[PDB]
């Protein structure tokens, strides 16, 4: 039977990485508690904890603690610099997204891609942009399917093969 | 000959929507002098005059002065009540273009879809929303790429058939 087309796993990533940033924000506060950086547009967002997508964003969550400290780190550091303007969120993000990707796509440069938009999201947030999260979800959306990576994952089983 | 892809029409939209905004911009500035409302970021945005994209939104922008007069008066009032974040601005403009192209698509359709990009910037500048010109260009390109609109402009032999 058909698993998931392109087109289908292209959808399916705003749900994905909602579910991620949601799961993500929560381990942040698990470990960091009173440290962790508050961004509330990351706890209201729209949610379904059991729905497949859910679980995918959830499970990319977890493992993204253990296997994305070094993409992350380097994010945090690096996105120090950036201003809070549409225009320059759009023109970094696009920059290192591409810049994760050249030499192809593997299921740990996807979650990096997941953490990136993750931590340029909240960055944007701290500096006052308020009611962007949206606009970074979309940036990682459109990203994905005209770079070939709803395509690549289409081709690995659909977004339930991160599972 | 092959004229113009549905993919060459897509990525053509960024240079013909910068173009009507400048131009239109400018026939604004003509027509109403001290009283046009001021945008800085329409009169420095990327432009090639001599290119075709670029004579083909200033062809729109002039046949627009004329035939989008009652998709424009509009658009200002039902502007006026937009907040200055990019959700609510993606938003808005995806209620508003979807409801343009609901019965199909024509030229006079595509136009008012520029102008409504226009005013929409315009207006989010007006309101504090600076650097957010770049996002409106992408939210036209990328509805004209994924609701057909580019493939219909293909289908009519490209942008050049506007001219
Ligand atoms: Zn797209």
């Given at each position: 039977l058909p698993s998931a087309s392109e087109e289908q796993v292209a959808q399916d990533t705003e749900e994905v990485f909602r579910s991620y940033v949601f799961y993500r924000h929560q381990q942040e506060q698990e470990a960091e508690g009173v440290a962790a950086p508050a961004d509330p547009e990351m706890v209201t967002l729209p949610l379904q904890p059991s729905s497949t997508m859910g679980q995918v964003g959830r499970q990319l969550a977890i493992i993204g603690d253990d296997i994305n400290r070094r993409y992350d780190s380097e994010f945090q550091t690096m996105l120090q610099?950036?201003?809070?303007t549409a225009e320059n969120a759009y023109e970094y993000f696009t920059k290192i997204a591409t810049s994760l990707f050249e030499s192809g796509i593997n299921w740990g440069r996807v979650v990096a891609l997941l953490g990136f938009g993750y931590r340029l999201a909240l960055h944007v947030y701290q500096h006052?942009?308020?009611?962007f999260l949206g606009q970074v979800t979309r940036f990682v959306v459109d990203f994905m399917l005209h770079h070939c990576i709803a395509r690549w994952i289409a081709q690995r089983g659909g977004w339930v093969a991160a599972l």
């Open positions: 610099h950036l201003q809070p006052g942009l308020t009611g």
